[PDB]
């Protein structure tokens, strides 16, 4: 099975492990994980975070042929489980000084879900892309501006967290994957750049 290939100690996730648009697994509702986690599910989580780290590292991205990412969901690896990894880096200042915090968000989340959210919507100005989508897709992907999420970490500890800004957008994108929803499902069908009054456009 896919899981067996992915969790081998020496195996590094790369683009050849990422399934593409059209594969039915991307449209399923992923299965909840049970705790305590199996070794496979723990290792998968670690491999997913490793992939994100590598995708953001100039050398390793080059060695492995990686498209840069800030999030990854198990369904994109053909594993229909409610597991996501998110890694959103902070940026250097104009003087080249590293940020105080390397990441605004770094987590492997099991059974994550949105439990509440703002009435206000938001969308990235530049739209969204997807590791599984090898097409140009224009338009505002309309999401909740702010969300409260619950999730479990690999230990089974429950977390409750409010998110805004880019963190909110990233987590929503990944949670959509484990519900079988694709980013373009949330782009206006008639005018991709339509703006409903009050939409928060994030630069
Ligand atoms: C807004 C989140 C978009 C994340 C994607 C990667 C992806 O497909 N994640 O599921 C990606 N595109 C650019 N960076 O990551
Ligand atoms: Zn591989
Ligand atoms: Zn079930
Ligand atoms: Zn471990
Ligand atoms: Zn490494
Ligand atoms: Zn709601
Ligand atoms: Zn929602
Ligand atoms: Zn609750
Ligand atoms: Zn459409």
Short mmCIF file of C-alpha atoms and ligand atoms in Angstrom, two decimals:
data_model
loop_
_atom_site.label_atom_id
_atom_site.label_comp_id
_atom_site.label_asym_id
_atom_site.label_seq_id
_atom_site.Cartn_x
_atom_site.Cartn_y
_atom_site.Cartn_z
CA UNK A 1 0.00 0.00 0.00
CA UNK A 2 0.99 3.67 -0.33
CA UNK A 3 1.47 3.96 3.44
CA UNK A 4 4.09 1.20 3.45
CA UNK A 5 6.25 2.92 0.81
CA UNK A 6 5.98 6.31 2.58
CA UNK A 7 7.02 5.22 6.10
CA UNK A 8 10.23 3.34 5.13
CA UNK A 9 13.04 4.88 7.23
CA UNK A 10 15.12 5.96 4.23
CA UNK A 11 12.19 7.15 2.12
CA UNK A 12 11.88 10.88 1.56
CA UNK A 13 8.57 12.20 0.25
CA UNK A 14 8.90 13.95 -3.11
CA UNK A 15 6.61 15.03 -5.96
CA UNK A 16 6.32 11.46 -7.25
CA UNK A 17 4.45 10.57 -4.05
CA UNK A 18 1.88 13.33 -4.58
CA UNK A 19 -1.28 12.25 -6.41
CA UNK A 20 -2.83 14.50 -9.01
CA UNK A 21 -6.11 16.13 -9.86
CA UNK A 22 -8.53 13.44 -11.01
CA UNK A 23 -7.43 10.79 -8.54
CA UNK A 24 -10.60 9.80 -6.62
CA UNK A 25 -8.78 9.89 -3.26
CA UNK A 26 -8.76 13.73 -3.42
CA UNK A 27 -12.59 13.76 -3.38
CA UNK A 28 -13.23 11.36 -0.47
CA UNK A 29 -14.01 12.33 3.11
CA UNK A 30 -10.88 11.14 4.90
CA UNK A 31 -11.17 8.68 7.81
CA UNK A 32 -10.60 9.91 11.38
CA UNK A 33 -7.48 8.61 13.11
CA UNK A 34 -7.80 6.75 16.40
CA UNK A 35 -5.53 7.17 19.44
CA UNK A 36 -3.08 5.94 20.46
CA UNK A 37 -1.67 6.41 16.95
CA UNK A 38 -0.18 3.49 15.07
CA UNK A 39 3.55 3.70 14.30
CA UNK A 40 2.66 4.21 10.60
CA UNK A 41 0.43 7.21 11.34
CA UNK A 42 3.01 8.83 13.60
CA UNK A 43 5.79 8.31 11.07
CA UNK A 44 3.60 9.57 8.21
CA UNK A 45 3.02 12.80 10.13
CA UNK A 46 6.80 13.20 10.59
CA UNK A 47 7.50 12.48 6.92
CA UNK A 48 4.91 15.08 5.90
CA UNK A 49 6.47 17.78 8.08
CA UNK A 50 9.87 16.74 6.69
CA UNK A 51 8.55 17.24 3.16
CA UNK A 52 7.47 20.79 4.01
CA UNK A 53 10.85 21.58 5.60
CA UNK A 54 12.61 20.23 2.50
CA UNK A 55 10.31 22.11 0.13
CA UNK A 56 11.31 25.35 1.87
CA UNK A 57 15.06 24.57 1.96
CA UNK A 58 16.91 25.82 -1.16
CA UNK A 59 19.29 22.82 -1.25
CA UNK A 60 16.90 20.00 -0.42
CA UNK A 61 14.15 21.42 -2.68
CA UNK A 62 16.71 21.34 -5.50
CA UNK A 63 18.01 17.83 -4.70
CA UNK A 64 14.50 16.39 -4.52
CA UNK A 65 12.82 18.48 -7.25
CA UNK A 66 10.33 19.98 -4.83
CA UNK A 67 7.61 22.50 -5.40
CA UNK A 68 7.50 24.86 -2.38
CA UNK A 69 4.66 24.35 0.06
CA UNK A 70 3.33 25.55 3.41
CA UNK A 71 0.83 22.70 3.94
CA UNK A 72 0.25 19.07 3.00
CA UNK A 73 -2.66 16.71 3.64
CA UNK A 74 -2.51 12.89 3.78
CA UNK A 75 -5.05 12.46 0.95
CA UNK A 76 -2.51 14.12 -1.42
CA UNK A 77 -0.23 11.14 -0.69
CA UNK A 78 -3.11 8.74 -1.49
CA UNK A 79 -3.74 8.13 2.24
CA UNK A 80 -7.36 8.78 3.16
CA UNK A 81 -6.76 9.83 6.78
CA UNK A 82 -7.43 13.08 8.67
CA UNK A 83 -3.79 14.12 8.98
CA UNK A 84 -2.38 17.50 7.87
CA UNK A 85 0.97 19.24 8.25
CA UNK A 86 1.34 23.02 8.19
CA UNK A 87 4.55 25.04 8.19
CA UNK A 88 4.19 28.78 7.61
CA UNK A 89 7.51 30.67 7.81
CA UNK A 90 7.99 34.20 9.08
CA UNK A 91 10.09 36.49 6.88
CA UNK A 92 13.42 38.30 7.39
CA UNK A 93 13.37 42.07 7.90
CA UNK A 94 14.75 44.58 5.33
CA UNK A 95 18.16 44.33 7.06
CA UNK A 96 18.36 40.56 6.56
CA UNK A 97 17.76 39.72 10.21
CA UNK A 98 15.95 36.43 10.79
CA UNK A 99 12.51 36.73 12.45
CA UNK A 100 12.17 36.20 16.25
CA UNK A 101 10.03 33.13 15.47
CA UNK A 102 11.08 30.99 12.51
CA UNK A 103 7.41 30.01 11.86
CA UNK A 104 4.03 31.62 12.53
CA UNK A 105 2.61 28.09 12.56
CA UNK A 106 4.29 24.67 12.64
CA UNK A 107 2.18 21.60 13.43
CA UNK A 108 1.13 18.14 12.42
CA UNK A 109 -2.60 18.03 13.15
CA UNK A 110 -4.71 14.89 13.53
CA UNK A 111 -8.51 15.07 13.16
CA UNK A 112 -8.48 18.85 12.73
CA UNK A 113 -11.72 20.74 12.19
CA UNK A 114 -13.17 24.26 12.09
CA UNK A 115 -15.45 24.67 15.15
CA UNK A 116 -16.30 28.35 14.63
CA UNK A 117 -15.39 31.24 12.36
CA UNK A 118 -15.89 34.88 11.54
CA UNK A 119 -18.79 36.15 9.46
CA UNK A 120 -16.13 38.02 7.45
CA UNK A 121 -14.50 36.26 4.49
CA UNK A 122 -10.92 36.56 3.28
CA UNK A 123 -8.92 35.57 0.22
CA UNK A 124 -5.26 35.71 -0.78
CA UNK A 125 -4.67 38.49 -3.32
CA UNK A 126 -2.47 36.16 -5.41
CA UNK A 127 -4.96 33.27 -5.32
CA UNK A 128 -3.94 29.76 -4.32
CA UNK A 129 -2.04 26.87 -5.85
CA UNK A 130 -1.99 23.19 -5.08
CA UNK A 131 0.70 20.49 -5.17
CA UNK A 132 -1.86 18.18 -6.84
CA UNK A 133 -2.89 20.70 -9.53
CA UNK A 134 -0.67 21.21 -12.58
CA UNK A 135 -2.82 23.96 -14.14
CA UNK A 136 -2.98 27.74 -13.93
CA UNK A 137 -6.04 28.57 -11.81
CA UNK A 138 -6.93 32.26 -11.46
CA UNK A 139 -9.15 33.87 -8.86
CA UNK A 140 -9.93 34.63 -5.25
CA UNK A 141 -10.39 31.52 -3.18
CA UNK A 142 -13.02 32.75 -0.72
CA UNK A 143 -12.47 31.50 2.82
CA UNK A 144 -13.35 32.45 6.41
CA UNK A 145 -11.24 35.37 7.59
CA UNK A 146 -10.78 33.94 11.09
CA UNK A 147 -11.32 30.45 12.42
CA UNK A 148 -11.25 28.54 15.68
CA UNK A 149 -9.94 25.03 15.15
CA UNK A 150 -9.66 21.92 17.30
CA UNK A 151 -7.15 19.19 16.56
CA UNK A 152 -5.07 16.48 18.27
CA UNK A 153 -1.30 16.22 18.15
CA UNK A 154 0.60 12.93 17.72
CA UNK A 155 0.41 12.34 21.49
CA UNK A 156 -3.39 12.54 21.46
CA UNK A 157 -3.46 15.87 23.33
CA UNK A 158 -6.37 18.10 22.21
CA UNK A 159 -5.69 21.71 21.18
CA UNK A 160 -8.10 24.60 20.59
CA UNK A 161 -6.67 27.52 18.61
CA UNK A 162 -7.89 30.76 16.98
CA UNK A 163 -6.20 31.68 13.68
CA UNK A 164 -6.23 34.68 11.40
CA UNK A 165 -4.34 36.02 8.39
CA UNK A 166 -2.30 33.61 6.29
CA UNK A 167 -2.33 30.93 9.06
CA UNK A 168 -6.15 30.81 8.82
CA UNK A 169 -6.09 30.47 5.01
CA UNK A 170 -3.44 27.71 5.07
CA UNK A 171 -5.20 25.57 7.68
CA UNK A 172 -8.55 25.92 5.89
CA UNK A 173 -6.96 24.81 2.60
CA UNK A 174 -5.55 21.67 4.26
CA UNK A 175 -8.72 20.84 6.18
CA UNK A 176 -10.62 21.08 2.85
CA UNK A 177 -8.36 18.28 1.53
CA UNK A 178 -9.44 15.88 4.25
CA UNK A 179 -13.09 16.70 3.39
CA UNK A 180 -12.59 16.13 -0.37
CA UNK A 181 -12.78 19.84 -1.24
CA UNK A 182 -10.40 21.52 -3.78
CA UNK A 183 -9.40 25.18 -3.69
CA UNK A 184 -11.15 26.01 -6.94
CA UNK A 185 -14.49 24.85 -5.48
CA UNK A 186 -14.36 28.18 -3.61
CA UNK A 187 -13.65 30.44 -6.62
CA UNK A 188 -16.61 32.36 -8.15
CA UNK A 189 -17.89 30.42 -11.19
CA UNK A 190 -18.67 33.43 -13.38
CA UNK A 191 -16.06 36.01 -12.37
CA UNK A 192 -13.00 34.54 -10.59
CA UNK A 193 -12.09 38.02 -9.27
CA UNK A 194 -15.54 39.07 -8.01
CA UNK A 195 -15.37 40.86 -4.67
CA UNK A 196 -18.38 40.74 -2.38
CA UNK A 197 -18.34 43.83 -0.19
CA UNK A 198 -16.41 43.25 3.03
CA UNK A 199 -14.10 40.56 1.64
CA UNK A 200 -10.70 40.85 3.30
CA UNK A 201 -8.07 40.67 0.55
CA UNK A 202 -4.74 39.53 2.02
CA UNK A 203 -1.54 40.83 0.41
C1 LIG B 1 -2.86 28.52 0.81
C2 LIG B 1 -2.27 27.14 1.01
C3 LIG B 1 -1.82 26.53 -0.32
C4 LIG B 1 -0.85 25.39 -0.06
C5 LIG B 1 -0.25 24.83 -1.35
C6 LIG B 1 0.25 23.40 -1.13
C7 LIG B 1 -0.91 22.43 -1.07
O1 LIG B 1 -1.40 21.96 -2.09
N1 LIG B 1 -1.34 22.11 0.15
O2 LIG B 1 -2.39 21.23 0.33
C8 LIG B 1 0.72 25.74 -1.84
N2 LIG B 1 0.76 26.67 -2.78
C9 LIG B 1 1.69 27.56 -2.42
N3 LIG B 1 2.21 27.18 -1.26
O3 LIG B 1 1.59 26.06 -0.89
ZN1 LIG B 2 8.67 8.58 -2.90
ZN1 LIG B 3 -14.97 5.96 10.61
ZN1 LIG B 4 8.29 9.55 16.10
ZN1 LIG B 5 16.23 16.81 5.86
ZN1 LIG B 6 -20.28 28.23 9.80
ZN1 LIG B 7 -16.32 26.70 6.77
ZN1 LIG B 8 -15.03 21.71 21.13
ZN1 LIG B 9 -15.56 26.44 -10.98
#
